[PDB]
Amino acid sequence: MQIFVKTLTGKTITLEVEPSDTIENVKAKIQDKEGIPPDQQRLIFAGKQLEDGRTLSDYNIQKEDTLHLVLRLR
Ligand SMILES: [Mg+2]
């Protein structure tokens, strides 16, 4: 399924994912597309800060949901 990850400027990063993909895996996909190291990425959905070891399904993320990406220096 596709999900969207919005950056601070409103850019959409579209990812192809499965419900059993982890947040670690999502950050790896973002690194591959955008070149941003996973350790610099913070993902948020429905007000929750998303933990690397949990899955999309653990957060009830569904097709075409919009996550937010916030970045940190390092
Ligand atoms: Mg896969």
Q: Where are the beta strands (DSSP E) in the chain?
A: 2-6, 12-16, 41-45, 48-49, 66-71
Query: Distance between CA 22 and CA 26 in Å, rounded?
Result: 6
CA of residue 17 to ligand 1 center, whole Å? 6
Residue spans of the domains in the chain: they are 1-74
Q: Are 42 and 70 in contact (CB under 8 A)?
A: yes
- CB-based burial of residue 56 (10 Å sphere; 0-12 exposed, 13-18 middle, 19+ buried)? buried
Method: X-ray
CA angle 8/10/13 to nearest 5° reads 95
Resolution (A): 1.2
How many A from CA of 22 to the centre of ligand 1? 10
Q: Are strands 41-45 and 2-6 parallel, antiparallel or unpaired?
A: unpaired
25-31: long-range contacts, CB 8 A cutoff, minimum separation 24: 26/50, 26/56, 26/67, 27/52, 30/5, 30/69
Cα-to-centroid distance, 59 and ligand 1 (Å): 17
Query: How many helices and strands in the chain, by DSSP H and E?
Result: 1, 5
Q: What tokens were used for 22?
A: 């982890």
Tell me the CA–centroid distance for residue 62 and ligand 1, in Å. 15
